[PDB]
């Protein structure tokens, strides 16, 4: 069974930084593209980052491009999201996800909450 | 025009009754395949189904047969027959465009299905 477990969230301040982790299991991690998706307090979903299977390519939406960095350590079966220069708007539940076939988000983790407050 | 997903308004339903949710693609992308997601209280979003322009679709694991999808022009639909109590959730449609220059993924605003 596919399992994704995020961690690293907590209370932070605007301008601060933190790094989230996602431990993967139940599948061959190095064979799949991985993603980060977040859900704001108003329940809106927003795709945050993409990283190819070997870490060769990454993509981000304009809202977080020069601030967030997605990376992975295939030997550790772990996905990461470095979040720097935090904005209040980054407050959300962060989920790691894996796709299936042509679907980006087929499997989702339980999520970790990042709370940004002044 | 930017890739946009517009969803039908959140409504309440009676158990057993039927429901039809709508997700409309921006005209320039009316041939796109979308995904439907369901999110129950305090749970992460769940992959419900991949719906194509021709109406063909494939549901995810644990998805009740009473869940069906169809299309019409830029409209992509999610029909729930025999509305049960466990159906109360937020339904969000999403669409991806793996453009080499810049990947794009857009989520709809979501539709609250109160039962």
């Amino acid at each position: 069974q596919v399992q994704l477990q995020e961690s690293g969230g907590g209370l932070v301040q605007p301008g601060g930084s933190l790094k989230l982790s996602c431990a993967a299991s139940g599948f061959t991690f190095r064979d799949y593209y991985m993603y980060w998706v977040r859900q704001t307090p108003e329940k809106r979903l927003e795709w945050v980052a993409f990283i190819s299977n070997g870490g060769g390519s990454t993509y981000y939406p304009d809202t977080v491009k020069g601030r967030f960095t997605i990376s992975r350590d295939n030997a550790k079966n772990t996905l990461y999201l470095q979040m720097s220069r935090l904005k209040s708007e980054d407050t959300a539940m962060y989920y790691c996800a894996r796709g299936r076939g042509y679907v980006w988000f087929a499997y989702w983790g339980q999520g970790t909450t990042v709370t940004v407050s002044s | 025009m930017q890739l946009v997903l517009t969803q039908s308004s959140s409504a309440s339903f009676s158990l057993g009754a039927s429901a039809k949710l709508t997700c409309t693609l921006s005209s320039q992308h009316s041939t796109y395949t979308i995904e439907w997601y369901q999110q129950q209280p305090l749970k992460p979003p769940k992959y419900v189904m991949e719906l194509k322009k021709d109406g063909s679709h494939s549901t995810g694991d644990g998805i009740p047969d009473r869940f069906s999808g169809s299309s019409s022009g830029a409209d992509r639909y999610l029909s729930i027959s025999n509305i049960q109590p466990e159906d109360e959730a937020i339904y969000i449609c999403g669409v991806g465009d793996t453009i080499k220059e810049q990947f794009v993924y857009v989520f709809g605003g979501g539709t609250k299905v109160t039962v």
Binding site: G101, A106 | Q28, T31, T33, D97, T98, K100
Partner: peptide
């Protein structure tokens, strides 16, 4: 109109 670009997730 535009043609949607997709990618197989397992490689």
């Amino acid at each position: 109109q535009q043609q949607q670009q997709q990618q197989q997730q397992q490689g």
